[PDB]
Design an enzyme around this catalytic site. Structure first.
Site, PDB file in Angstrom:
ATOM      1  N   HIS A   1     -10.921  60.305  45.033  1.00 62.28           N
ATOM      2  CA  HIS A   1     -11.540  59.603  42.930  1.00 62.28           C
ATOM      3  C   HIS A   1     -11.932  60.945  42.280  1.00 62.28           C
ATOM      4  CE1 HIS A   1     -12.202  56.542  45.662  1.00 62.28           C
ATOM      5  NE2 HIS A   1     -11.997  56.945  46.381  1.00 62.28           N
ATOM      6  N   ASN A   2     -11.181  60.110  41.273  1.00 63.96           N
ATOM      7  CA  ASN A   2     -11.841  61.367  39.598  1.00 63.96           C
ATOM      8  C   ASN A   2     -12.314  60.202  38.858  1.00 63.96           C
ATOM      9  OD1 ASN A   2     -12.463  63.451  37.895  1.00 63.96           O
ATOM     10  ND2 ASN A   2     -10.120  63.454  38.151  1.00 63.96           N
TER      11      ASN A   2
END
Length: 305
Positions: free
Chosen positions: A91-92
């Site tokens: 995730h970012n």
């Protein structure tokens, strides 16, 4: 309803036998082939989007943490794209905080310590302030995986074949029988490395400072609320004094922010902060033991030098 029964039963752990659909079809009470065909529709149509083994990241030997970078807006997007390149970043997000870039990194064993990896990332993107937070959601022992277990995990981690004999192709590829594969798969399940095989807006990460003799009750209290999904905990540190995390969603800060003040009021927790997701630069899941990370790290050494 057959749809109800099937949908429900493929979310249960699919058994480690040669013809597990033969078994689910028995339990569901329908013909195997027809059970298979039905499953396809459910994944073709996207109410279940994937059916796969779920492995335990830390029992695989992956260290993983939530990282935060403090980046300025001119260079926010440049850095974000650099992060998404990392095959171990799942995730970012851009979040509303001094630290405005938050991503999840996971690192395979026997390559580098996690801290080294993030060090070289911050050094490469010339980020001065960064956080390395290890949180945990809400008896098993770590044994380093053999190269075979790694290959096993490598090829089995994808979509589970919707065929009569779904471990046969895997076993052929690994040059062993189904029986020898299932043998190894069962042992990894007994060790908890393999958990199970199954099918499965406005958003914020709420962070809170809570005394440890209350975090379980507080966590369970928050876990009861609509708009709250998973709860996590970590240690406190000088770089970050929040020890309780709660993932929150709704219609906007408004719908969302309101659901915050309440918790703060009812449990008298004035120490907290709302880190809204304003942008997502990645939401995929990492492939374990793919050779794309190890190399990516080389390109990183190579790069830096």
């Amino acid at each position: 309803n057959e749809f109800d029964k099937i949908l429900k039963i493929i979310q249960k752990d699919i058994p480690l036998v040669k013809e597990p659909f033969s078994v689910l079809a028995q339990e569901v009470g329908i013909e195997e082939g027809k059970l298979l065909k039905t499953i396809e529709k459910l994944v073709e149509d996207g109410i279940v989007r994937h059916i796969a083994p779920i492995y335990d990241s830390r029992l695989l030997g992956y260290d993983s943490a939530l990282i935060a970078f403090k980046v300025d807006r001119q260079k926010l997007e440049e850095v974000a794209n650099f992060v998404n390149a990392c095959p171990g970043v799942s995730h970012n997000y851009e979040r509303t905080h001094d630290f405005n870039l938050w991503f999840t990194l996971a690192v395979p064993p026997e390559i580098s310590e996690l801290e080294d990896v993030v060090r070289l990332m911050a050094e490469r993107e010339r980020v001065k302030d960064y956080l390395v937070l290890r949180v945990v959601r809400l008896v098993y022992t770590y044994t380093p995986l053999t190269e075979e277990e790694k290959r096993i995990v490598s090829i089995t981690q994808g979509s589970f074949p919707l065929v009569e004999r779904p471990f046969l192709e895997y076993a052929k590829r690994l040059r062993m029988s189904e029986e020898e594969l299932l043998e190894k798969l069962s042992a990894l399940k007994e060790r908890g490395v393999l958990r199970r095989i199954s099918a499965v807006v406005a958003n914020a990460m709420s962070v809170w400072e809570v005394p440890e003799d209350a975090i379980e009750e507080v966590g369970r209290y928050i876990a009861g609320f609509k708009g709250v999904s998973h709860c996590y905990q970590r240690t406190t540190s000088e770089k970050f004094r929040y020890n309780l995390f709660a993932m929150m969603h709704g219609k906007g800060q408004e719908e969302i922010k309101l659901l915050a003040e309440t918790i703060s009021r009812e449990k008298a927790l004035s120490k907290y902060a709302l880190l809204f997701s304003t942008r997502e630069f990645k939401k995929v899941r990492i492939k374990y033991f793919s050779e794309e990370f190890e190399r990516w790290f080389k390109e990183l050494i190579s790069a830096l030098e």
